[PDB]
Design a protein around this ligand. Structure first.
Ligand SMILES: Nc1ncnc2c1ncn2[C@@H]1O[C@H](COP(=O)(O)OC(=O)[C@@H](N)CO)[C@@H](O)[C@H]1O
Lengths: 70, 417
């Protein structure tokens, strides 16, 4: 069963420079280019953090390009 | 090592280049008539102008609810022309399902026709007043499109369905790879027979229209009738088409399938391809090459391909490989600790590269749980976890072995129990 689906796992939330988010199991080394913003915590609490913080799925560069059209 | 330059990074650039180069060639055979590239693009430009005057702007999502027809093709092109992403609605699905998709994707406009009318922002293309307005608008010059803007949002089954948003950059890679690999010419005829809600239809519509080839549009429902498909293929000398494995079996059980002698390349994807079915194909249509393609909606239609039937292929045996990655795509076979497995060992397929979707519209938690940080790629990159169990063979081709979960296919349609 996939570790990102393990309801009993221990999880972090990671974000990259494009302000995209990833669930992440605490047992795995954090990949380069990603920063821990929440956890270690339960899967449900990590997903709640993501659902309340990641409100725009566009990569940051695209959003900034669209804001500059003004 | 699949890195490859891209001539263009948007689908609008690819379609527009072809519209100039192939203007007076036939683009569409549909509805009993023939339309040239020039005519199709004039009509798509009028629709883009109408969408723009109704508030559609780059970055928006426009739902499309039209039966398979010339008007469907024009609508998809018009939406893209206006800088928007299209959300295909299969007019067979029940109304409540379509309404929920429009809500989740925040589609503010729905393009449809009177037959398929029985939602906010409805444009009815064959309403008298709307026909008159289209005739009275100048075709709109293509909007500027950023490659990371979406080209389409397609829903798949959700263990509530999830809407996969795929950027221009991702589908531009997928279609240019396809054209490099199989090399359509303007004399080719690809069949439009896949329902518009299945992402295979994205290349049926757009691959011929970025090359100067002709799209032969099957009637609504005709994909259900293999004798009709064989007749259509013979009538218009169709040279390229798609089947899902279960419907390929149905096609080969049809006595007149052998009349499709103009076929030179068939693409099979969506389910495991068995070796006895591939052998049956080669007995029935020896001049038609057959390739097995694989991929999830989350990674722009297909990420791997394998040549199965044709000159130069290996003898077929089970499992028939799903093959090797397409351009600008990486494959990892990982264990449950996220470590790469040695060659031949079974683990779960993870996908990297330019074709990954943006994510699931309106569903950040779900997105972050399946498009995860990438240990192997450049800093800040992601992987999509497929849920597919695979192994890599000695020679490097990948074999599909089954699922980590309970997901199933019906007639190629992804279904979550
Ligand atoms: N050649 C193949 N062999 C075995 N299983 C396959 C396959 N192609 C697709 N699949 C299965 O179909 C799933 C993707 O289904 P879907 O997103 O509906 O997309 C699609 O099906 C289309 N995007 C494929 O073109 C894959 O994760 C895998 O389980």
């Amino acid at each position: 069963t996939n570790p990102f689906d393990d309801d009993e796992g221990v999880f972090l939330v990671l974000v990259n420079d494009e302000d995209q988010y990833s669930l992440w199991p605490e047992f795995a080394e954090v990949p380069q280019g990603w920063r821990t913003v929440f956890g270690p915590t339960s899967r449900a609490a990590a997903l709640d953090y993501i659902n309340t913080h990641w409100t725009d799925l566009r990569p940051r560069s695209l959003r900034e390009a669209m804001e500059a059209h003004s | 090592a699949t890195r490859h330059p891209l001539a263009e990074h948007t689908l609008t650039a690819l379609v527009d280049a072809a519209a100039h180069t192939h203007a007076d060639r036939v683009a569409l055979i549909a509805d009993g008539i023939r339309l040239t590239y020039r005519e199709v693009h004039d009509r798509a430009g009028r629709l883009a102008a109408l969408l723009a005057e109704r508030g559609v702007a780059p970055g928006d999502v426009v739902a499309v609810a039209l039966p398979r027809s010339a008007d469907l093709v024009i609508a998809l092109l018009g939406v893209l022309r206006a800088g928007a992403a299209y959300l295909p609605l299969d007019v067979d699905h029940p109304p409540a399902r379509l309404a929920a998709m429009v809500e989740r994707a925040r589609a503010g406009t729905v393009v449809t026709c009177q037959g398929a009318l029985p939602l906010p922002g409805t444009v009815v293309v064959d309403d008298a007043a709307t026909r008159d307005r289209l005739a009275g608008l100048e075709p709109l010059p293509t909007r500027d499109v950023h490659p990371d803007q979406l080209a389409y949002t397609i829903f798949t089954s959700g263990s509530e369905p999830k809407g996969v948003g795929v950027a221009h950059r991702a589908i531009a890679n997928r279609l240019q790879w396809m054209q490099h690999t199989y090399r359509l010419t303007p004399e080719d005829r690809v069949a439009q027979k896949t329902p518009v809600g299945f992402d295979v239809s994205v290349w049926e519509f757009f691959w011929p229209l970025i090359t100067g080839a002709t799209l032969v549009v099957a009637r609504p429902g005709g994909h259900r009738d293999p004798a009709y498909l064989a007749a259509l293929f013979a009538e218009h000398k169709v040279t390229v088409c798609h089947f899902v494995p279960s419907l390929l079996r149905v096609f080969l059980n049809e006595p007149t399938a052998r009349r499709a002698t103009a076929l030179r390349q068939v693409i099979v994807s969506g389910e495991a391809l068995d070796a006895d079915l591939a052998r049956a194909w080669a007995r029935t249509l020896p001049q038609a090459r057959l390739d097995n393609l694989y991929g999830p909606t989350e990674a722009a239609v297909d990420v791997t391909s394998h040549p199965v039937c044709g000159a130069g292929t290996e003898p077929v045996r089970d499992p028939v490989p799903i093959g090797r990655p397409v351009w600008n795509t990486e494959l990892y076979v990982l264990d449950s600790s996220l470590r790469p497995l040695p060659t031949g060992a079974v683990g779960e397929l993870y996908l990297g590269g330019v074709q990954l979707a943006r994510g699931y519209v309106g569903r950040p938690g779900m997105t972050a749980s399946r498009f995860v940080a990438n240990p192997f790629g450049p800093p800040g990159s992601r992987l999509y976890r497929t849920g597919d169990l695979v192994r890599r063979r000695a020679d490097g081709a990948v074999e599909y072995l089954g699922r980590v979960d309970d997901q199933v296919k019906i007639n190629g349609v992804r279904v979550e129990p």
